Amino acid sequence: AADKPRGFARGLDPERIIGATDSSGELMFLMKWKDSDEADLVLAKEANMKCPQIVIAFYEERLTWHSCP
């Protein structure tokens, strides 16, 4: 419960997603913004819409193939 602008409300350009988590119940991305070392959480559904190629680049970076696990 804060009052400073958070996430996409900070008005910064997305640089890179650095993690994905559904621990809250909904999928969120930890988003690195350009020219800021302070990353914060955004809803994946929102990022899917606003910066789909950023989303895809993260998935391609982390994509892994595993045998019967």
Next chain:
Amino acid sequence: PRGFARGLDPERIIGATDSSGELMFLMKWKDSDEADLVLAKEANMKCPQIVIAFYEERLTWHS
């Protein structure tokens, strides 16, 4: 004459493989039982929500 050139709408990506050296998606097209292989780079541009839906379905915490 294949992939996006068939003029069909993407329905779902069924699989992915980089075993050829480049990331390929196995693509299912609407109203066709014949899948084919498309470069990820091309699907990323032409149906990104379809690509994202594939990765989202596959996301997990444990192998």
Next chain:
Amino acid sequence: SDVSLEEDREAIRQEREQQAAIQLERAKSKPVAFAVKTNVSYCGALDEDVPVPSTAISFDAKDFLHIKEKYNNDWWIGRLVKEGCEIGFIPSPLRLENIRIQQEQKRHIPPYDVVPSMRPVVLVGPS
């Protein structure tokens, strides 16, 4: 022949270094395993124990690193997430803790914040 024993030691070091350089080169094609944010700076140019000479990365505090894998108790493999920076050896959090213990005496916050993350996993055959 007190210096034939030292050629034996050198041959052992060289073989270990060759294998390290291979594992480093082969890490380039692996997926990123996880990201970290650093709480300390580190200058790989001044480190002396690097599995391959001159391949330790450097970073400032509050940088992000991409980790491809863990090499041993003292070293990981990855890169500083900045344009032009290439993959190299990354001091493990334990190594950084032990550097800090030394920098302390002669002249608590973990050195990395690990970012746990889900990953897309595509199932292959049980091979």
